[PDB]
């Protein structure tokens, strides 16, 4: 406080109000079914359909995280790429809650 | 104000870059199933009242010019902005059909000081792409 | 679906259920007052005090984002480091909502 | 289950690494005001019913051994885990008093497969440190 607050003229950071919804954790592969689409986009769309009229966006995205993490696993004849998992990654520099039904 | 104002005349743009097919010179294999994702997204964001614009198989250069042009529109009547990137990727990088683009180049166009008609408004980047080559074997 | 879901044996990703509350955006400086502490920790503690019995953790952290972004600005005799701003960065790989009053 | 179970006998540990003073060889200046942060955090997390453990001026090696030992405790009766890092930093890096440590080394101890008594439970890393040398001049 003192020198660093109660500014006469208000500014906001240039990176404020961005949200990144990443399909996977930093450094990791992300997975896609050739017929049904990617795990992440499938789950994102299904959770938006079910909850966009009911939940705040971060809470919708937390259910996407759980759906991808818990329900999906890779399948491959190559053992290297078989039985692999994925956790999506929410990066929020938002400053307020986001409700689509608003 | 704990919530973003979402009752502007328009919810805003939803730009979907759907990259399925990649130049031979990159050695990147076709992204089968991405069209199913693109269609799901179009319908989902249409029901949220977004103006959806789908683009297919864009070069790194076309991605950059598209996002530049979109950032230079007047977004004054729009509540928000959504961009969905569907492609190959690595950490901090999304692939055009002909090679890598730095995500920062894309997102910087929409910074608070560079897209003034979106200052104070939520800018959402939804990214289906790899972020490296680590493998999660899970537990339990 | 089919090959990649309704697993007989359930696993979760090894990076699931982590949350990173970063003081600042990726690539950026983070700021500290020599007498009052860092902007981020000051704001984090104040928002936990006020809302930990009322809001879910991501919503508490979204108010920390707004408090840091809107209320604080650097002050220095060196013009290079003066009038600078900061947006904290929430990185959530959580799979559920977190309520401290639970 | 939309919410983490938070009615285990203990809320869990809150580990605070408070690095104020750095070896001459690093050229890192003293972090005045960090003790105010450490005290605020201790009181705040005490009121949330966390078991708070404060540590001051740890070498890179002491940080690594501390987090290893903590990850090897039996957390079965605890709802969650919190670690707060207060130091100099750069992207992906936190400084011990005598030099940089990769954050990944710290966090990997708590992975779902490596700390089984915290599998399924929220692991929170709260980081006050720089993540590079970019400068936000803001807008408005
Ligand atoms: C790395 C990336 O940027 C892409 C992101 C994307 O395309 O959305 N990720 C992949 O390509 C992911 C990772 C790998 C590891 C390296 C080899 C390429 C591989 N790969 C891949 O072949 N697919 C598609 C296949 C589809 C087969 C099918 O539907 O039968 N999926 C798998 O190999 C594993 C799999 C995953 C989910 C369901 C079934 C199988 C990828 O998505 N990747
Ligand atoms: C880069 C880091 O890891 C640290 C993180 C931390 O210590 O919590 N960040 C800084 O050190 C930040 C950045 C810089 C840029 C390079 C020179 C060092 C500088 N710096 C710094 O000197 N402080 C402390 C001073 C305190 C002076 C005071 O209270 O009068 N703060 C400032 O220089 C600017 C300032 C910020 C808030 C309020 C008043 C002044 C930093 O925090 N940093």
Domains in chain C: boundaries: 1-102
Which of these, B99, B64, B98, lies nearest to B83 by C-alpha position?
B64
What is the rounded CA–CA span in Å between residue A13 and residue D138? 4
**Residues 48-67 in C contacting A (C-alpha not used; CB under 8 Å):** 56, 58-59, 61-62, 65-66
Q: Nearest by CB to C5, which of A59, A65, A72?
A: A72
Q: Give the torsion sign (CA, D21, D27, D32, D33).
A: negative
CATH topology of domain A1-102: Alpha-Beta Plaits (3.30.70)
Ligand 2 contacts CB of residue C84 (under 6 A)? no
In chain B the beta strands, taken as DSSP E runs, fall at 10-18, 51-56, 78-86, 89-90, 93-96, 99-102, 123-128
Neighbouring residues of D100: CB distance < 8 A, sequence distance ≥ 6: D60, D90, D93, D94
- Where is chain C discontinuous (C–N over 2.5 Å), named by the preceding residue? none
By most ligand atoms within 8 Å of CB, the mutation choice from C32, C41, C78 for ligand 2 is C32
* CB contact at 8 A, C85 and D137: yes
SS3 of D109, please? coil
Residue D2: list chain A partners with CB under 8 A. Answer: 63
| Structure-token pair, residue C10 | 């359930």
* CB contact at 8 A, C19 and A89: no
Nearest chain A alpha carbon to B35: A37
**Nearest residue CA, atom 43 of ligand 1?**
A31
CB pair distance less than 8 Å for A17 and B41: no
Full DSSP string of A39-85: HHHHHHHHHHHHHTTTS-HHHHHHHHHHHHHHHB----SSGGGSS-B
Phi and psi based region of residue A40 (left: phi greater than 0; alpha: psi -120 to 50; beta: remaining): alpha
Chosen from D2, D92, D103 to mutate, greatest number of chain A CBs within 10 A: D2
By most ligand atoms within 8 Å of CB, the mutation choice from A23, A32, A76 for ligand 1 is A32
Closest approach of chain D CAs to the CA of C7, in angstroms?
Answer: 18
Ligand 2 contacts CB of residue D22 (under 6 A)? no
Touching subunits for chain A (3+ Cβ pairs under 8 A)? B, C, D
Distance from residue D77's CA to the centre of ligand 1 (Å) = 39
Which of these, D39, D38, D122, lies nearest to D84 by C-alpha position?
D38
Ligand nearest to the backbone CA of B33 = 1
* CB contact at 8 A, B90 and B131: yes
Residue-number span of the structural domain to which B139 is assigned: 1-140
Ligand 2 contacts CB of residue C73 (under 6 A)? no
CB pair distance less than 8 Å for A25 and C95: no
Ligand 2 contacts CB of residue C70 (under 6 A)? no
SS3 of B105, please? helix
Supply the CATH number for residue D83's domain. 3.40.50.1460
Closest approach of chain D CAs to the CA of C4, in angstroms?
Answer: 21
Count up the domains in chain B and report the number: 1
What are the distances in angstroms from CA A66 to CA A72, A88, D74? 10, 9, 25
User: Is B130 one of the annotated active-site residues of the chain?
Assistant: yes
Closest approach of chain B CAs to the CA of D7, in angstroms?
Answer: 23
Full DSSP string of D33-95: THHHHHHHHHHHHHHTT-EEEEEES--HHHHHHHHHHHHTS--TTEEEEEEEEES-EETTEEE
Please report, in angstroms and rounded to a whole number, the separation of the first and last CA atoms in chain C. 35
Element spanning D16, H or E:
strand D10-18
User: Is B14 one of the annotated active-site residues of the chain?
Assistant: no
Q: Give the torsion sign (CA, D126, D10, C94, B124).
A: negative
């Amino acid at each position: 406080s003192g020198v660093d607050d109660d500014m006469a003229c208000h500014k906001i950071p240039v990176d404020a109000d961005f949200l990144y919804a990443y399909s996977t954790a930093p450094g990791y592969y992300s997975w896609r079914n050739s017929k049904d689409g990617s795990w992440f986009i499938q789950s994102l769309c299904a959770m938006l359909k079910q909850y966009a009229d009911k939940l705040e966006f971060m809470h919708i995205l937390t259910r996407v995280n759980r759906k991808v993490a818990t329900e999906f696993e890779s399948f491959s004849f190559d053992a290297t790429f078989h039985a692999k998992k994925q956790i999506p990654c929410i990066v929020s520099m938002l400053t307020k809650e986001l409700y689509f039904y608003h | 104000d704990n919530s973003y104002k979402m009752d502007y005349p328009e919810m805003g743009l939803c730009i979907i870059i759907n990259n399925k097919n990649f130049h031979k010179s990159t050695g990147m294999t076709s992204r089968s199933g991405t069209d199913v994702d693109a269609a799901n997204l179009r319908e989902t964001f249409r029901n949220l009242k977004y103006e959806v614009r789908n683009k297919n198989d864009l070069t790194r250069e076309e991605i950059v010019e598209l996002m530049r042009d979109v950032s230079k529109e007047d977004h004054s009547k729009r509540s928000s902005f959504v961009c969905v990137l569907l492609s190959h990727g690595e950490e901090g990088i999304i692939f055009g059909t002909n090679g890598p683009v730095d995500l920062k180049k894309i997102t910087n166009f929409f910074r608070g000081d560079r897209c003034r008609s979106l200052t104070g408004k939520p800018k959402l980047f939804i990214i289906q792409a790899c972020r490296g080559t680590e493998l999660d074997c899970g537990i339990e």
